[PDB]
Design a protein around this ligand. Structure first.
Ligand SMILES: CC(=O)N[C@@H]1[C@@H](O[C@@H]2O[C@@H](C)[C@@H](O)[C@@H](O)[C@@H]2O)[C@H](O[C@H]2O[C@H](CO)[C@H](O)[C@H](O[C@]3(C(=O)O)C[C@H](O)[C@@H](NC(C)=O)[C@H]([C@H](O)[C@H](O)CO)O3)[C@H]2O)[C@@H](CO)O[C@H]1O
Ligand SMILES: CC(=O)N[C@@H]1[C@@H](O[C@@H]2O[C@@H](C)[C@@H](O)[C@@H](O)[C@@H]2O)[C@H](O[C@H]2O[C@H](CO)[C@H](O)[C@H](O[C@]3(C(=O)O)C[C@H](O)[C@@H](NC(C)=O)[C@H]([C@H](O)[C@H](O)CO)O3)[C@H]2O)[C@@H](CO)O[C@H]1O
Ligand SMILES: CC(=O)N[C@@H]1[C@@H](O[C@@H]2O[C@@H](C)[C@@H](O)[C@@H](O)[C@@H]2O)[C@H](O[C@H]2O[C@H](CO)[C@H](O)[C@H](O[C@]3(C(=O)O)C[C@H](O)[C@@H](NC(C)=O)[C@H]([C@H](O)[C@H](O)CO)O3)[C@H]2O)[C@@H](CO)O[C@H]1O
Ligand code: NAG
Ligand code: NAG
Ligand code: NAG
Ligand code: NAG
Ligand code: NAG
Ligand code: NAG
Ligand code: NAG
Ligand code: NAG
Ligand code: NAG
Lengths: 163, 321, 321, 163, 321, 163
């Protein structure tokens, strides 16, 4: 993906994280576990919801075929009518299929971006107080208990304390 | 001790396409294309369609004896007609501006039939012998019930002068016809007068028809032809007929009580005895999808038609193997 | 000591929409949709429109007495006609291929009127008594000024044979008519000859009209009908008329001096005495926008019409709260 | 946003920077102030200008309705004509509104990208000679006067001198 | 020691456009627009087009003497006709529903000509003197070869009653005509009977034509007119003619042996003696591109037409200076 | 570009690298040379190939003009016919030119993204065992022979050995 996180430096997703799209996995002396990041997840849910509705609404008003009858010596206008109706179907079919293709690609990259931004958010808090492993994980120099882990999730990790 | 950043995976096998990659497995997706229908012709919004079965619009409106089902029809949501209905013009001929009339029906939800010229009223002409073997009813020769085939009485066809004033506060669909005989001998046999005409007048209409004689192939066992004409007679306006021969007089004229959204749907299907809010010639639709791919020509509150086989939006993210 | 990287904010409240988010406040934006008009019918590029007011195109071209304003009209940028102009065909009837003629006017910017048949020239027929109460002028019975309603002189209608050669190096719009009388008694009263015709010939035209008699409803106090026909007579070509009755002869025929871009605009509006470079039936447009949403049918150098209420492009970045 | 800078790790914009879209804010013993980055700003101005003109030009040639008259027994072709004219308006309306939606989204992300690239440009110069605070700011280990600040803005920051 | 990450550059000067930047030099690109053609009218899929040269479709089908090249034509992939072919209707007139017939030809790949009425068979009428100076052949007066201009024999024009039964298992294109004389004296000179008609009947057709007399401008040295009519006679159905004057009888009627995809192409170009799989009125196309910009109206397996001057896709990356 | 690598922190491309789109250049006591990164290159080749085919296929079904003839008193329907045929050409021309414009821009950014992701991939392996120069290059603290260089290209660079 464009942002290099999903199937990138983070090789795979977590079957074990069911309460969100993006989040954290901690491991220390007390144990290990998954915690979904509510903020980034809800933002993603809002963005994708709006997108689907935006997509629907734009297509909502679009060409509708009508039945028109022509006799045996009105073949030219019968043909004109057919090409007109077929022509608009092709235009609107193309629009639908292209929009889906383009926006699907943007949706996957949006998720990739959200993971990256969440990763950097943590990286920027920890600074040189942890080893950047290269796989999405940060290994602490100090022992990090469940409260210490919660501060990283908080956005409240006190760098000056553990420096 | 460590903290990791990661993303959701699951057991989903749903795939989506993108520009650069096809069949990308995602954790969540949303199909937006309705692919199914029930396969039946249904009532729309509870309101039953007018199903002509094997009768055509002409057969119904002219009152072909096989279309006795469709005398004084109830109001319809839409109309259903086959591609090649057998019960069309029983007596061979043409229907003038038939397609323009059919188009008018797309704006019409209900007709009420009324008598403008009584059949008994033809005291100076013979009105009960105007039948043919081409339009049979119960094994006996009959004719289009809504119009009267007039012929001479005691070997004399006196000039007809008839006028009807539209006192209803409605537009009125008036139908009439002219008969084209096989030869000069048949012209005299039926109407006696060698040269004949039919003049029809309204505020707008200024018509004068003359019978065209020609040797024609037998259609439905008859080489004679009937050419049918129509008009919309506005309220407070009168229609005037004058003819010395070959006149097919209007007994009944349809009254347009309701003008609404309607359509003449082409389908070989019959009646499912179901209800729907969106109908196609293939069958009815019941879905919340924004799109469908069943059939372009629909009636009612419908999703938009596209030619796609598949429209799936990614909602979730790329799912891991 | 520190150095920071940052971005512009400001007091802007302009918002733009995106796929994922609506009403995003941005520092700078650019509206590209023209939403306003002056509300007036204006001169286009200084060149005044032909405003028919309550006259129709037929009324103007046939020379209806109420349309005396529009004899020898100056050249027009475009034409303005109401939806239901009262001064149409004063004497009831039809105008043959009226819509095709109206379409021809979309390619025409100026007519010059010329006399092809002088009214005095009818020495063998009566030409000054061809009037009706349906076309009144100054409280007296009149007729379409451009054509002559010819009648018998001293109880005789001799056959008319008239030819005009188009010596102008222009196409020429020729108009003429046929009269349809109420009954056989009126036919004889006016023209005497019971059976009559009108034959019209050019290099291309091969026409022969016969009066159709019928009892008709009174329109404008008359049950008689006038059916009007036209042609474009090319240069160096002649038109030939022959008739023994019911002929409405051409006094004047219009000359097509200028062929340009024009349009027949449908509007109830009158005249603003303004000037513009882009005109609509709602009013005129003065903007540099690429788009507008006023009305689809425009004339001149205009932005493109769309059905949108709002088109705003983000130029700046997301503005902070 | 996709690039995580605007309303991201840089929480908000600067009312105090009026001469550009992106730039720097310095603070030291001598004082503090905003300096717009001319290069990145001009590049953004060019990109957005071209985009607006590109957008206009693509729409410049598009369907124009024409008035056509039909009589009372030409209702089918009158209806065909209406559907044809209405159909193209819907196609072109959809194109306009969609293009605006899609390109607006790209424009905001373009700005987000420019801020990010400018931030990294500085980060890559300073290297380990300053603390990355996590908020768009870099705090120097050495005292950095107005000439020192100018070298960072220059692209000329001499890492080997202050190392 | 160091390791660097970097990207490809090369000597390419190919440029592509984007929304924000034009003329961006890239390492690799792919043109998708076919801009060239050979400039010739070619055989399609080996199958030669019917090139009418200076003859029109009417001239060919009626059998104009200048169109002797096109008697019993071989099957064609498509048809080529000029914008203003000189060899059209040699004798002046009209062709009825000509455009609808031309449209029918778009579904037709081969005609086979057959005789339905032999010219010798007219034993009661004169058939060999029906010629004119307007249709000259080898310096002598001739006529449309496919139809017979019938005239009176020994100063008598007896009524014609002729019927043909379509025993071929094919649809049959039948052509016939009516003659419009200059005056009443010419009507009698040619056919004697003052009032004449032509009645034509099939299972569907119910026609009766009468000559319209008018004074007309000389076209090709003649002021008389010929109006030509047609029908498709279905298998096992018969056509019936009856006339007492002015009848242009069918000698030959075309047989529709093959119905396929075809088109009437408008072009001034002649014949390149080449072969192609995609043909335009400008010339033929040979490319694997998805698009072209030569001409909208094409026949065969073609790329899609667009109005663009340039369509280039970036495949590679931004190339360095 | 959006990702800031191509014509960004990596000023220019390499005429000397002919066997791929993205790759590495090493220099040490033994010598210097270009090595194309096969994986990222092949991924780029696949993405662009599919894109071109996707683009072609979507346009494959599109309006085709047909010749229709009208007489002198059928000018309205002749004009309707012309506007219908011209209208669809403008719609399909616009679609083609816009799609090319939009996807060209995405293609350039895709390449920029691939270079960035490859750069970060290396950065994340090396960690603090090399100096990040700011120009796409990493200067090693330890002497790095051709096997050492190969491990970085491998994805196998043993950080713990050289730490
Ligand atoms: C062999 C023979 O000469 N039989 C006559 C029969 O005429 C022929 O037989 C018919 C059955 C066919 O084989 C024809 O080839 C041929 O005409 C006589 O009448 C019949 O034929 C006439 C046409 O000439 C009519 O077709 C008639 O049918 C009706 C009908 O439509 O059913 C009878 C009906 O009562 C008539 N109705 C009215 C209001 O006039 C109509 C009508 O006159 C015509 O349709 C107008 O075009 O015709 C056949 O019965 C019969 C009786 O005259 O005698 C046989 O010996
Ligand atoms: C009750 C009665 O018999 N009154 C006659 C009147 O005819 C009737 O009264 C008129 C007022 C209406 O109520 C009609 O129902 C009825 O016709 C006599 O003539 C009038 O009616 C005739 C029609 O039959 C004409 O309508 C005529 O009007 C003109 C006209 O168009 O204004 C007079 C004009 O001078 C004529 N012009 C020419 C060139 O002939 C035309 C023209 O003949 C027709 O329009 C052709 O269709 O008719 C009414 O005046 C009048 C006098 O004749 O006497 C009452 O006693
Ligand atoms: C000065 C004069 O009176 N000359 C007559 C000539 O008639 C005139 O001269 C011709 C040459 C033109 O200048 C005209 O102004 C005028 O017609 C006589 O006949 C000619 O004119 C008639 C029409 O009146 C025809 O045009 C005729 O040509 C043909 C033709 O089409 O070639 C001769 C052909 O044999 C005829 N074929 C048949 C089957 O009838 C047809 C046909 O009758 C008409 O086309 C039907 O409308 O006409 C010219 O030759 C001639 C001999 O009659 O004598 C001059 O002295
Ligand atoms: C994607 O899946 C469909 C059906 O599951 C298959 O027919 C098609 O070949 C696949 N496409 C590609 C590019 O692998
Ligand atoms: C009948 O029609 C006439 C027009 O011919 C109209 O004026 C009149 O009011 C109508 N009503 C009655 C009751 O005759
Ligand atoms: C955006 O603003 C408009 C106009 O102020 C408002 O009516 C609309 O509800 C808003 N839309 C959303 C999605 O909040
Ligand atoms: C008149 O028209 C004839 C055709 O009938 C043409 O040949 C001639 O040149 C014209 N000019 C004059 C002065 O009659
Ligand atoms: C791009 O190149 C073309 C052809 O070489 C040139 O005509 C055009 O002006 C250039 N456009 C810009 C914006 O530089
Ligand atoms: C001729 O046509 C008639 C219909 O008129 C048809 O029934 C018959 O089979 C045809 N064939 C022959 C050989 O008469
Ligand atoms: C987050 O967690 C810490 C404990 O790790 C707690 O003391 C603090 O109050 C919390 N802050 C927020 C903002 O949730
Ligand atoms: C940048 O600023 C320094 C002073 O800090 C000055 O010496 C140098 O010449 C400037 N360089 C550029 C490229 O402006
Ligand atoms: C990569 O290179 C090293 C030598 O530097 C070699 O020993 C190792 O096996 C290789 N590993 C892979 C995965 O190619």
């Amino acid at each position: 993906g464009l942002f290099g996180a999903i199937a990138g430096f983070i090789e795979g997703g977590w079957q074990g994280m069911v309460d969100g799209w993006y989040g954290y996995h901690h491991s220390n002396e007390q144990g290990s576990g998954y915690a979904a990041d509510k903020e980034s997840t809800q933002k993603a849910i809002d963005g994708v919801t709006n997108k689907v509705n935006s997509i629907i609404d734009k297509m909502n008003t679009q060409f509708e075929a009508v039945g028109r009858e022509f006799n045996n010596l009105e073949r030219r206008i019968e043909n004109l009518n057919k090409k007109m109706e077929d022509g608009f179907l092709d235009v609107w079919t193309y629009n639908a299929e292209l929009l889906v293709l383009m926006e699907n690609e943007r949706t996957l990259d949006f998720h990739d971006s959200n993971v990256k931004n969440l990763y950097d958010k943590v990286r920027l808090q920890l600074r040189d107080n942890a080893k950047e492993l290269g796989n999405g994980c940060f290994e602490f120099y100090h022992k990090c208990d469940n409260e210490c882990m919660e501060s990283v999730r908080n956005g409240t990790y006190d760098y000056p304390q553990y420096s | 001790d460590q903290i990791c950043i990661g993303y959701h995976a699951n057991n989903s096998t749903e795939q989506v396409d993108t520009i650069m990659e096809k069949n990308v497995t995602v954790t969540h997706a949303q199909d937006i294309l309705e692919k199914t229908h029930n396969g039946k012709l249904c009532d729309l919004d509870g309101v039953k369609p007018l199903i002509l079965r094997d009768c055509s619009v002409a057969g119904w409106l002219l009152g072909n004896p096989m279309c006795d089902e469709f005398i004084n029809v109830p109001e319809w949501s839409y109309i259903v007609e086959k591609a090649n209905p057998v019960n069309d013009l029983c007596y061979p001929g043409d229907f003038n501006d038939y397609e323009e009339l059919k188009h008018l029906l797309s704006r019409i939800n209900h007709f009420e039939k009324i008598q403008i010229i009584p059949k008994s009223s033809w005291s100076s002409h013979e009105a009960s012998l105007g039948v043919s073997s081409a339009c049979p009813y119960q094994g006996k020769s009959s004719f289009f019930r809504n119009v009267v085939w007039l012929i001479k009485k005691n070997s004399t066809y006196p000039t007809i002068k008839r006028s009807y004033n539209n006192t209803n506060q409605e537009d009125l669909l008036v139908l009439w016809g002219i008969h084209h005989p096989n030869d000069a001998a048949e012209q005299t046999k039926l109407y006696q007068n060698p040269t004949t005409y039919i003049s029809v007048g309204t505020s707008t209409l200024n018509q004068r028809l003359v019978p065209r004689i020609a040797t024609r192939s037998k259609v439905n066992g008859q080489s004679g032809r009937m050419e049918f004409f129509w008009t919309i007679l506005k309220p407070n306006d009168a229609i005037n007929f004058e003819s010395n021969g070959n006149f097919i007089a209007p007994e009944y004229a349809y009254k347009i009580v309701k003008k609404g959204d309607s359509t003449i749907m082409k389908s070989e299907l019959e009646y499912g005895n179901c209800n729907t809010k969106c109908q196609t010639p293939m069958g009815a639709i019941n879905s919340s999808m924004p799109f469908h791919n069943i059939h372009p020509l629909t009636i009612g509150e419908c999703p938009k038609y596209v030619k796609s086989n598949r429209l799936v939006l990614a909602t979730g993210l790329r799912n891991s193997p």
